[PDB]
Structure 1
Amino acid sequence: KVFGRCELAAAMKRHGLDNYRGYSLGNWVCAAKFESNFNTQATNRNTDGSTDYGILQINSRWWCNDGRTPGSRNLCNIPCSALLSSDITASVNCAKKIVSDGNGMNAWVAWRNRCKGTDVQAWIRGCRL
């Protein structure tokens, strides 16, 4: 599923990401924009042999199981395919664990490089919330 901006903001709010670990909704929408372009089916292979999955590009080394990533810990206890679903619940549940792991949203390199410090409120402009 390719979400619209405000559609994704609404879904993230419904699943309790708004201000989760102190990160406002626009931070999450911005992260998703640059990780996946709002596409739940996004997959990308990393240089270390792991793969990133879904709207927030969650990796298969630490977080989910894809069966082809040696050293897989699967800390979200979920097949990586579950992170590609049109329903964002599994991605949100796993993102909550990731952002709680110590470094906040810096876990997402794209967030650090493209969202952090910017006017992230723009990502929720005009949305009914």
Structure 2
Amino acid sequence: KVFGRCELAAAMKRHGLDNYRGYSLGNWVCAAKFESNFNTQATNRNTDGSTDYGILQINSRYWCNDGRTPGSRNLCNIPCSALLSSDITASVNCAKKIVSDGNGMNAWVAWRNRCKGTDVQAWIRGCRL
């Protein structure tokens, strides 16, 4: 599913991401925009053989099981395919664990390079929240 900007903001808010760990909703929508362009089915391969899945581009090296990333962890306790769903629940629960891991949103490279320190409020302009 490709989400609309405001559509994703509502689901995210609903799922408790607004100010989760001190990160305003803007931050989360910006991250989704740059990581997958709001596409739940985005997948990308990394050089170490791990894969990034879904809307938040969650990595198999640490967070999910894809049966093909030898000696990686499955910290969110889910098959990576659960992250590709139209329903963002699994992606959001998993995100919550990632962001609390110590590096905050720096875990997301597109956030760090394109969202961090920008006027993230713009991402939710005109949404009915």
Equivalents in 1 of 2:89, 2:15: separation in Å?
Answer: 7
Q: Note the C-alpha offset of 1:71.
A: 1.4
Q: Note the C-alpha offset of 1:72.
A: 1.8
* Runs of 4 or more consecutive aligned structure 1 residues displaced over 4 Å after TM superposition: none
Equivalents in 1 of 2:111, 2:39: separation in Å?
Answer: 16
Q: Note the C-alpha offset of 1:60.
A: 0.4
Q: Note the C-alpha offset of 1:69.
A: 0.2
Q: Note the C-alpha offset of 1:78.
A: 0.2
Q: Note the C-alpha offset of 1:51.
A: 0.1
Show CA shifts across 1:12-46 (max 9, x none): 00000010000000000000000000000000001
Q: Note the C-alpha offset of 1:70.
A: 1.0
Q: Note the C-alpha offset of 1:119.
A: 0.4
Equivalents in 2 of 1:73, 1:47: separation in Å?
Answer: 17
What SS is found at the alignment partner of 2:52? strand
TM-score w.r.t. length of structure 2: 0.99
Count the aligned residue pairs. 129
What stretches of structure 2 of length at least 5 have no aligned partner?
none
Q: Note the C-alpha offset of 1:7.
A: 0.1
Identity of aligned residues (%): 99
Equivalents in 1 of 2:32, 2:18: separation in Å?
Answer: 14
What stretches of structure 1 of length at least 5 have no aligned partner?
none
Equivalents in 1 of 2:108, 2:34: separation in Å?
Answer: 10
1:86 counterpart = 2:86: yes
- Report the aligned-residue RMSD: 0.4
